[PDB]
Design a binder for this molecule. Structure first.
Ligand code: 149
Ligand code: MG
Ligand code: MG
Ligand code: NA
Ligand code: NA
Ligand code: NA
Ligand code: NA
Ligand code: NA
Lengths: 1011, 204
């Protein structure tokens, strides 16, 4: 019947969806959430065999293990074991678009397991098997007998095996299909894999059982009083002696308990539900749940007899919180939320899409440590443990249905088709039935990029009807359709409108006030962190803080989707689209995370942490005003450390305890600061430190910081006259300046300083020349599809203008001797096919003190695309271990992404001055630098710089970081100016006007000398 | 202005004058101006100005040069934004072109006297035998900035001997969102800390 090519059949013999069950036969264990003997894991070693199509599977496999099969670990994606290649494609379906058909060559994975089952499980009750995740469709057999079928890769499929099992040894046989009609609803921009990638278990339930239960919590006006309501449903034979007891616990203290026989209130003309009962428990002064303080209670649902015999128990963590939209604002416990969130895919560099507790916890810790309080399940229901962790650690979750049909034309072709309503409804309804009891889930999502169809409006209302406790959102069709309670655009800009036809992305500030609009606005996706990105991030947060209805958003995204591969030497390297022979593919577009696949931070993470701080500061005189953005907690684990320094040198510091109420302010007056010893700029730096450790952080964790320029004393003291005078040696091909053991050689043909000698040691490997280009960042290249070549992308404009090909032409090179120095004057014109792109005029002044002052004045043709940078570069013959500088740091920072950086004296090993982006590009820059020290060299002025063993040329021509090779010496790039990196999105020019080098005329001056 | 440095150097085809000043008050150095005047064999004086402004002093109204020329001409010819008065935050209406107006039109008769008549984005200015080139803002009239701020009514102003010229590399916005509180937007305040501008003064 080829059930995998029929959207009308999404499952066969599958049991109803429901909340997590464990079937405890001991209440104490249900209360403490301890392991349950009635819930067995079948994870471990299984037998697996790969076939090109389901037609190639031998019938023998159904009742006997195939000798050709291997023993593999489950859960797992078979591509990760090497049976076939994982495919990375963004929008374009990996299969021919011809719904509901899939290729005849359909990779088939045949799993089998021989396991034991005790007669005690078969003599009484029900024994069911549970597959938390199978990609993307499968048929189940038990002891050679066909059991059922299932679809939807991100929700569990359960089947009753009570009639197929036998005492002793049993054998399962699962035929998993890579492609099915369900694949048409799973076109998310991520690796395309398959297999039994989530847990498999066996659950025993009594015949008379708790089949479902819903927990709700409503409050009075000030939340000082609450009522917990628990509806419980049963299956089996109804008896007058059956009872249901629901008890609520706060730690070891039982707070409330209620018992009642089955039989619900009258529903309609035919009566009520005799197989259901609702318990209502009163709770005074409940400890409220929030991401700030994840207070949790434990609800225990007991099914028992009047005489006191327990039949079974279920339970869940309960969080007392209310979520509602009122007067245009998303409120939590009556307070307007400010969503500091991020999108997070279930990705592991080695295991693929198999999630483990360790990785989940690591992500959560890093998230909260970096001031995030929310996560969006892009774009499907997550591993069940995820919700438990967000419940306990405290993170707001947007639970999203596994529905994305991005590759359709138009996007809503399937979702506006009633023939697909069934398949869609199951992805939404089964998600709600599974996760509705988790307090962490505060918003439901109908899926992602499936345009907007009538099926969306239908399912939108279904959720509103069955679960009024959570708002529903969906971005397809314009981000503001009738299928969403929240305006949730993706990559809508802060001030700039993008009037696309039919589905415009208005600037978020303008979106809010459109005629008749009243809903709150939270971007489901923004600040695309692909590579060297997050430029302009601060602009979003200034807006979020000023506009009440702009309530944040979810950064895209958390972690790069790179996979581990091994080279000839067997060493691991990070791969992306196309590295597995997968084609078509969208290359590096799968890496858009704030952290690398191994969870190592990208520089952008710190910019995020800074902007998302929960404490805001203002300086007036010597008074620091600290405002709290927390909505529920007082700052009872915060200490403010302040430090004043004169250009890096510490002059004074202290620490004051913070005691600010949520939404409150605290005034802190700094003691009279001693007068700076010399000239320079005083800088005030304050940091909020958490003295005590928490569930998500260690003692001494820094949660917020800010800097301010205080008094400055301009140096009016002119240096002493030098002893010796530099000597000029004019030759036909060179202008050589001599001063003691030092020598500067300027080539008269090129007009560039080609070499420097300190004694007999050459200082340069490459001449000091102007540079107006950079190894293009992901945002410069701007393609979300490898097949598309955007001529409007910055890199194409630069290439087309000849910026990368431009040749310097000497216009002038003269030398002059002054009273105490030698003045070299130069002028170069950079041209491309007759067009003069840039003109650089310089003067080099080498005085008796051995300093070479370099003054640069550049002209940029107003009609050529604004240059990526304006500076100089050279290859220093030396390679030192450290880099020391006075400026912004310690991490990499660009013009539109430097708010998190602080002005101070920084010292790091040379390696840290290079950011290992998987896709190489310009990186490691540090801005606002007044002094740079490397080996014997020292550069002064006001510039931006990067330094490493990789020339811009190699970075630009190398596709993977692991293929880079340390060049001889050290490449230095010092820019008087540098263009912004952008990032609002990575498929169109995103660098804001203020960060484009459009001034036409630029001036900067550097001083090069010996340290 | 406290003189920090004043030197002279003879080059191949030019004389170089280097200077450094520090404007202070109550022992506080407010600004520091470093310049070089390069007069070559063609009679052109290239002036390069680099100024430092203490970060803790209120941003200055302008960063430029001024002098009182002895000559009094009838016309003012310039290549820049015009023909009317325009300031950094009020120049969208002005157009770049060759403008030529009588001296009187370069003065805006506000009843209450103040800085007036500025014209921005000027690459060339001509007055009498003089010509200034670069990329500056300027106002030119028979009234000094001093007289303007000391005189309450326009009818009390008296033409001073010669002509007062104010060539600025940078000028603060004029604001106006209201007239009873600071209203000059941030992007129009001279807060860069270090400013650079150059001019070429010659005869025509
Ligand atoms: O709009 C989007 O942008 C991202 C680009 O990396 C990613 O494809 C998301 O899944 C999609 O919703
Ligand atoms: Mg089907
Ligand atoms: Mg997509
Ligand atoms: Na807001
Ligand atoms: Na992507
Ligand atoms: Na505190
Ligand atoms: Na590259
Ligand atoms: Na006046």
């Amino acid at each position: 019947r080829r059930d995998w090519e029929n959207p009308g059949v999404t499952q066969l013999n599958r049991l109803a969806a429901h909340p997590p069950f464990a079937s405890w036969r001991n209440s104490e264990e249900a209360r403490t959430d301890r392991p349950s003997q009635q819930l067995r894991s079948l994870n471990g070693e299984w037998r697996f065999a790969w076939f090109p199509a389901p037609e190639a599977v031998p019938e023998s496999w159904l009742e006997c293990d195939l000798p050709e099969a291997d023993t593999v670990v489950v859960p797992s994606n078979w591509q990760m074991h090497g049976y076939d290649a994982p495919i990375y494609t963004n929008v374009t379906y990996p299969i021919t678009v011809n719904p509901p058909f899939v290729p005849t060559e359909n990779p088939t994975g045949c799993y089998s397991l021989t396991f034991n089952v005790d007669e005690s499980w078969l003599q009484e009750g029900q024994t069911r098997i549970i597959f938390d995740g199978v990609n993307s469709a499968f048929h189940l057999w038990c002891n050679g007998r066909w059991v059922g079928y299932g679809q939807d890769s991100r929700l569990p499929s359960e089947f009753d095996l009570s009639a197929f099992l036998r005492a002793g040894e049993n054998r399962l046989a699962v035929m998993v299909l890579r492609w099915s009609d369900g694949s048409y609803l799973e076109d998310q921009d991520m690796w395309r894999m398959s297999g039994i990638f989530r847990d498999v278990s066996l659950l025993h339930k009594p015949t008379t059982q708790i089949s479902d239960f819903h927990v709700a919590t409503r409050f009075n006006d000030d939340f000082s009083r609450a009522v917990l309501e628990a509806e419980v449903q049963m299956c089996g034979e109804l008896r007058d002696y059956l009872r249901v007891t629901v008890s609520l616990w706060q730690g070891e203290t039982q707070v409330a308990s209620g018992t009642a026989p089955f039989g619900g209130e009258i529903i309609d003309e035919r009566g009520g539900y005799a197989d259901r009962v609702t318990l209502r428990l009163n709770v005074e002064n409940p400890k409220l749940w929030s991401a700030e303080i994840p207070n949790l209670y434990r609800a225990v649902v007991e099914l028992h007899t009047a005489d006191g015999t327990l039949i079974e128990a279920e339970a869940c963590d309960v969080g007392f919180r209310e979520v509602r939209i009122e007067n245009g604002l998303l409120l939590l416990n009556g307070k307007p939320l400010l969503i500091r969130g991020v999108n997070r895919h279930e990705h592991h560099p080695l295991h693929g899409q198999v999630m483990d507790e360790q990785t989940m916890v690591q992500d959560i810790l890093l998230m909260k440590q970096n001031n995030f309080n929310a996560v969006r399940c892009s774009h499907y229901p997550n591993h069940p443990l995820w919700y438990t962790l967000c419940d306990r650690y405290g993170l707001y979750v947007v639970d999203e249905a596994n529905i994305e049909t991005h590759g359709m034309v138009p996007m809503n072709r399937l979702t506006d088709d009633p023939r697909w309503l069934p398949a869609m409804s199951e992805r939404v309804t089964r998600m709600v039935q599974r996760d509705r009891n988790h307090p962490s889930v505060i918003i439901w999502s109908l899926g992602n990029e499936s345009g907007h169809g009538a099926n969306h409006d239908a399912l939108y209302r279904w959720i509103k009807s069955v679960d009024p406790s959570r708002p529903v959102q969906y971005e397809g069709g314009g981000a503001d359709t009738t299928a969403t309670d929240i305006i949730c655009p993706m990559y809508a800009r802060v001030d700039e409108d993008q009037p696309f036809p039919a589905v415009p992305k208005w600037s978020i500030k303008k979106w809010l006030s459109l005629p008749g609009e009243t809903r709150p606005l939270i971007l489901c996706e923004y600040a695309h962190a692909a590579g060297n990105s997050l430029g302009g991030f601060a602009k979003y947060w200034q807006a979020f803080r000023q506009y009440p209805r702009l309530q944040g958003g979810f950064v895209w995204d958390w972690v790069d989707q790179s996979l581990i591969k091994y080279d000839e030497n067997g060493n691991p390297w990070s791969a992306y689209g196309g590295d597995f022979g997968d084609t078509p593919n969208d290359r590096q577009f799968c890496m858009n995370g704030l952290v690398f696949a191994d969870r190592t931070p990208h520089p952008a993470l710190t910019e995020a942490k800074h902007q998302q701080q929960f404490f805001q500061f203002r300086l007036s005189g010597q008074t620091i005003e600290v405002t709290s953005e927390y909505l529920f907690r007082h700052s009872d684990n915060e200490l403010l450390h302040w430090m004043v320094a004169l250009d890096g040198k510490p002059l004074a510091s202290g620490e004051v305890p913070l005691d600010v109420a949520p939404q409150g302010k605290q005034l802190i007056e700094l003691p009279e600061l001693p007068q700076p010893e010399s000239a320079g700029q005083l800088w005030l730096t304050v940091r909020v430190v958490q003295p005590n450790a928490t569930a998500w952080s260690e003692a001494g964790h820094i949660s917020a910081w800010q800097q301010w320029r205080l008094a400055e004393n301009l140096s009016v003291t002119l240096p002493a006259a030098s002893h010796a005078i530099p000597h000029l040696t004019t030759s036909e091909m060179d202008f050589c300046i001599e001063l003691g053991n030092k020598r500067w050689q300027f080539n008269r043909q090129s007009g560039f300083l080609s070499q420097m000698w300190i004694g007999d040691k050459k200082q340069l490997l490459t001449p000091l020349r102007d540079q107006f280009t950079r190894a293009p960042l992901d945002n410069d290249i701007g393609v979300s599809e490898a097949t598309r070549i955007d001529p409007n992308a910055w890199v194409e404009r630069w290439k087309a203008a000849g910026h990368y090909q431009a040749e310097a032409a000497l216009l002038q090179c003269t030398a002059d001797t002054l009273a105490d120095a030698v003045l070299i004057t130069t002028a170069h014109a950079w041209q491309h096919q007759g067009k003069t792109l840039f003109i650089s005029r310089k003067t080099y002044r080498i005085d008796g003190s051995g300093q070479m002052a370099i003054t640069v004045d550049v002209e940029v043709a107003s009609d050529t695309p604004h240059p990526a940078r304006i500076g100089l570069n050279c290859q220093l013959a030396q390679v030192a271990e450290r880099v020391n500088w006075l400026g912004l740091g310690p991490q990499e920072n660009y013009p539109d992404r430097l708010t998190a950086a602080c002005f101070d004296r920084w010292d790091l090993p040379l390696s840290d001055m290079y950011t290992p982006y998987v896709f190489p590009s310009e990186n490691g820059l540090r801005c606002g630098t007044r002094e740079l020290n490397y080996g014997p060299h020292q550069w002064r002025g006001d510039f931006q710089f990067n330094i490493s063993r990789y020339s811009q040329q190699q970075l630009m021509e190398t596709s993977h970081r692991h293929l880079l090779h340390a060049e001889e010496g050290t490449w230095l790039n010092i820019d008087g100016f540098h263009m912004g990196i952008g990032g609002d999105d990575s498929w169109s020019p995103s660098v804001s006007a203020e960060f484009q080098l459009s001034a036409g005329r630029y001036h900067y001056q550097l001083v090069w000398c010996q340290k």
